[PDB]
């Protein structure tokens, strides 16, 4: 069996959900979504914000908790074939994390940019903030935390210690979410200009660099893959 079709679902769920989100914001961007003080905004976007925050908290709690209670206690008595299967499942988790990172840190982030040269901001909760700051960033944070927890609880290589590159890869991109406080403060009191290269945005940049720990994470996963199931073939 080895790599199963959980990978197809992992790609497809993010793709379908974010295509629906993009359609939703393309329909309710103008026409209930330009004016933040209108009552139609309160039902089409503030409700979206509240619902997405509640669902994010509930989903994160359920997913991380389930992964933690179902952790493997007898890691020593794990066959190499089962370890290979678990390594492939962890690779699927990493694929889902990469897809979520793309959607959050590239697509919706530069989409907030398009909106920055068309409107004048009315609040910290513009239609694009609902989708980028409070939906896609939490989604990829949840996915990354889940991948880290899965590695730590199922893979013996990633057990017996917290991996530093994995911790950086999981937490640094998370740190962009509290870096939103810098964004709003850096737009209100500081730089009234809609400059997208202002130092007020370097907080995302600094913690966007921490995603380069994916390289250390990936060589760690390669070594975990090549523990018992290294071959043979490889190096022969």
């Amino acid at each position: 069996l080895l790599d199963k079709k959980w990978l197809t679902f992992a790609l497809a769920i993010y793709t379908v959900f974010y295509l629906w989100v993009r359609w939703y914001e393309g329909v309710y961007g103008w026409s209930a979504g330009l004016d933040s003080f209108a009552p139609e905004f309160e039902t089409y976007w503030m409700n979206f914000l509240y619902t997405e925050i509640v669902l994010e908290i509930v989903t994160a709690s359920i997913l991380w908790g389930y992964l933690w209670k179902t952790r493997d206690r007898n890691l020593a008595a794990l066959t190499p074939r089962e370890e290979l299967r678990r390594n492939f499942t962890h690779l699927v988790w990493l694929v889902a994390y990469a897809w979520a990172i793309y959607w959050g840190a590239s697509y919706f982030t530069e989409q907030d940019g398009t909106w920055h040269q068309t409107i004048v901001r009315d609040t910290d909760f513009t239609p694009s903030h609902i989708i980028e700051f409070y939906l896609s960033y939490p989604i990829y944070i949840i996915t990354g935390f889940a991948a880290f927890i899965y590695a730590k609880t199922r893979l013996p290589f990633f057990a017996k210690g917290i991996s530093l590159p994995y911790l950086v890869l999981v937490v640094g991109p998370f740190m962009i979410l509290p870096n939103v406080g810098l964004n709003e403060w850096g737009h209100t009191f500081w730089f009234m200009e809609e400059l997208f290269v202002a130092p007020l945005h370097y907080g995302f940049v600094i913690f966007g660099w921490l995603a380069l720990a994916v390289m250390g994470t990936l060589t760690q996963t390669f070594y975990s893959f090549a523990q018992g199931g290294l071959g043979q073939s490889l190096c022969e």
């Binding site: 103008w30 003080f37 409107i119 004048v120 901001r121 009234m192 200009e193 390669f222 490889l234 190096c235």
Partner: protein
Amino acid sequence: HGEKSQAAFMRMRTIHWYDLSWSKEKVKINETVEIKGKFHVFEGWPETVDEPDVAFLNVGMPGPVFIRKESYIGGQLVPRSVRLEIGKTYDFRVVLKARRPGDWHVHTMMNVQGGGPIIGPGKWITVEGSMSEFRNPVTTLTGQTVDLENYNEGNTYFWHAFWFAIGVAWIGYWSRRPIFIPRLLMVDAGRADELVSATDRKVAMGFLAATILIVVMAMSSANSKYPITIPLQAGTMRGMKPLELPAPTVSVKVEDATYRVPGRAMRMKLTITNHGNSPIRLGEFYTASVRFLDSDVYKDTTGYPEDLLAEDGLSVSDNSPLAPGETRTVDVTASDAAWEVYRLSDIIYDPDSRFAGLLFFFDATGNRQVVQIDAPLIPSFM
């Protein structure tokens, strides 16, 4: 649409837009709508806003639903940022060409280099037609007429696709062989020195040489075609000609100005002294895009946006004609739902409870005078 969120006091004292006019309310695709008016730069410019030494006459709209064909300050085109003088009055004119069908809230705005956007009144303009009919022709000094909607689009697409294909070819050439785990194990276990061997070096030399050669040849080809080019034109324009308004013959002293919390009205006590030689009557109070009118004195015929217009929102305790030389004190109430809809009542949240505005006085013959008032604005709770 960006107002109602800015500080009320800074909306009250930055720039006063008046004499606004819109040529059309409903247009077809490719048709033109012209927005005219005057704006006065307030003398008590807030310290938190940089002085308008570098200002841009912009348009508030949801993206390019219109294209700005022309914009004038004074009588001269202003495609770059301009320098404005605090205390001066300028007339402006913006010409827009309809591009996208729909109902759009069009604002006249001013961007200041160190203080952000100053949004003027917004008017709903309907555009009918199809976006496929929009044309943006332009004739160059080289004798060519092009459409700005699609000019250079194919060339841009081609060059980006070509370079993307080159990069993908490089990566794929290296990706035909196994990529990660065997190469990692070979580099770890002793010297690798086997994963990069000729003709890999020959292929890399070919890629490098072809890249440099293609860049040089493409630059030379793009210099033969389009032999005449100029750099991007930029630079703030000084010497904006302001309006030479006559000195008002009305002097107004705001002796105490208050407002109820909560409430939809603002109350002020004014001592109006009428100089000149004609009886005057107060007809309008403009504070921040909101016009409070005394219907017995003045009626709006310019199609001012209804939500910003209070036809009988200005009540004067004694609005009888003021004979020349005569001075009197009256209580003036500016009341409308706009005061709460546009969050002018949100001044209680501001760290500077001061207001500014324009009073328009009209005589019997109809000619009008603009006087500017500013005073502390004191909330009242009991």
